[PDB]
Amino acid sequence: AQCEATIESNDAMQYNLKEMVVDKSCKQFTVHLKHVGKMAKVAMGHNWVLTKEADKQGVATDGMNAGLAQDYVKAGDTRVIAHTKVIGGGESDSVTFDVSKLTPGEAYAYFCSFPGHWAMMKGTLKLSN
């Protein structure tokens, strides 16, 4: 139907969705990230970052060096298709991006770039089929 999806993140360092599908009828798509835990962002902040599967480790490594104030994502990172800000417990953030940045058939990776979270908080995104 909709060109929107909600994904939850918690205090156990997990996302509640392992895969996300963007419908081909969509021109744009919005991701609503919710932090349903009760930990503060300095200890367990979460974001949602979308890249091609192969840019994962690099984006993460460099986001890590950008710091909390930069949402742990290097500014102007060309590898990042879209990202939310870092949020803490009881908060939410939304990000909308152009579906045309995506390529039918390709698997993209989405993950949390907060220090050390990428290993556990990761999933796959792609176009409908």
Next chain:
Amino acid sequence: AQCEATIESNDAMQYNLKEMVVDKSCKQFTVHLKHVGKMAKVAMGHNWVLTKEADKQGVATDGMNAGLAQDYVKAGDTRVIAHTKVIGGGESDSVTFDVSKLTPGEAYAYFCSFPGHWAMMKGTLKLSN
């Protein structure tokens, strides 16, 4: 009794012990850290760091800034009583420290300083008979 203890770390970002007791008869205490998971040290490495409870956040912070080659511990950090190296799945490391560094009745914090791990990997250590 004896002056040693074994603690396990896993791919779920947890330690298996929340408290450790050093017996008062000990002059030397040895901690054996085991990584029972299978993830690489760059993605889910673990260490064991001992500080006064107070110093947890600061040591964690500076440690993260020290980098993997420094085992995520600021070199010569004086707030650090003892620490292991950063290890990956299938490995183990041990550290032996002088009990005289601890003062009876005080609480000590032990935690993992690998980026972002300190929030879920923490325990208390105390001297007792």
